[PDB]
Design a binder for this molecule. Sequence first.
Ligand SMILES: N[C@@H](Cc1c[nH]c[nH+]1)C(=O)O
Ligand SMILES: N[C@@H](Cc1c[nH]c[nH+]1)C(=O)O
Lengths: 238, 238
Amino acid sequence: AIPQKIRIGTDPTYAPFESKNAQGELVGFDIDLAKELCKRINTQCTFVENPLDALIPSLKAKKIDAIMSSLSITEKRQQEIAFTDKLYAADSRLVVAKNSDIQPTVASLKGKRVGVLQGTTQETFGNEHWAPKGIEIVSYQGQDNIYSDLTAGRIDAAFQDEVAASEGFLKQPVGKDYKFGGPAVKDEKLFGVGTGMGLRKEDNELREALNKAFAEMRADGTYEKLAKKYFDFDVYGG
Amino acid sequence: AIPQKIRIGTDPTYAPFESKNAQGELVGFDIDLAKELCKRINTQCTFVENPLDALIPSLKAKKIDAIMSSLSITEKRQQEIAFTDKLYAADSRLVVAKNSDIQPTVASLKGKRVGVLQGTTQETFGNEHWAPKGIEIVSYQGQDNIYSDLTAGRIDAAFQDEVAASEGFLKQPVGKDYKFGGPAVKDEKLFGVGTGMGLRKEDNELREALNKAFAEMRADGTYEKLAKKYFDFDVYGG
Ligand SMILES: N[C@@H](Cc1c[nH]c[nH+]1)C(=O)O
Ligand SMILES: N[C@@H](Cc1c[nH]c[nH+]1)C(=O)O
């Protein structure tokens, strides 16, 4: 029905969306979004932190009740779980050293190591369009160990969403020497064009009330205020 | 400039204008009306919670920049803060238990304890019109503690505004044994004709602007849309 305590699973390795801080506290625009969605439907929310590859199964095991983890909405994920309406747009791009040639293409990526987070939409674009053409796909848990292997030379490109790379790495002094290398690779039916909150297919009423609550947060100006402490561009798109 | 982020003070204990849900979300007609005014004014206002007898000092100490708290536009208060245009009408009535007397005569209040919210217009009238006359005026800090002491028999009448009493108490199942009653009590100087946002006299540009935004929420229909979430009659007047 509408559960009185909902357990939201998150992977806390993805700034600015969800990440831990000095005071250990969970922090980020997806965290802020869910806190506000929860008050608004008026129920107690607790966050469970797990790796992103474990969330979509924990949900089907009722170990958690929602997923908020910048989880992009895609045709394939949707033939297993349900999602709210679009919370904001996502785009994928590879990050490269400023001194590395590396392309969105089997050409200059041939025989290079691209790192992807396990469970993600770009781990699966990397296996279907890119490993057969000879570029090696290295999967990780913890988005922060991918950026850390990139700056150490261990991998040659880091593959993930644009705004997290941008805000969480390239605008930080550790990504000063790095850059996006190439466009966003285009695959609308694999990547999806936005993220949402993941929910079981059978919970139609907790899904309907989250959609209403979010709708309202976009119309009274609460979304624009929550977005503005992280972004100076329009995160939502349209 | 014109301020980017405005502090708004509210006492959130005055259903149906401002109150909180179990999760702390500020809810009510005054909350809706502020947020649409902020959006149209293109400003980022935030709500600070404070007992209404603190709100006019807080705005003098530049800790808040606005008051939205069902504050009556009066001439006594017009001598030290400025107000916006009339947001909606306000009337004062006493709330009394069924038949149990304290009836339409000032003499029937002699020796009875009349509960009032501290800092209010009814408090100011109580001690001018009625406390010289042998009636006991008891001031409280949250409107909810005036209705629970009425119920418990610890005071004999509760004096606050008419729509708040009726929609927050009399039409709720705790208010079933109660009614309006007591002498008709008027003083146009002390009481409003209605309510406005209260601000500093110094910040005149915000008023022209909030005034403008309000004016157009009203020809456009967003006022009527917000009011019908709450009232089945004209809250504005005519
Ligand atoms: N939006 C992408 C990437 C990602 C989500 N969370 C962490 N990384 C996905 O859902 O797979
Ligand atoms: N309108 C009345 C009563 C009140 C407003 N808020 C709480 N009580 C006043 O301004 O005093």
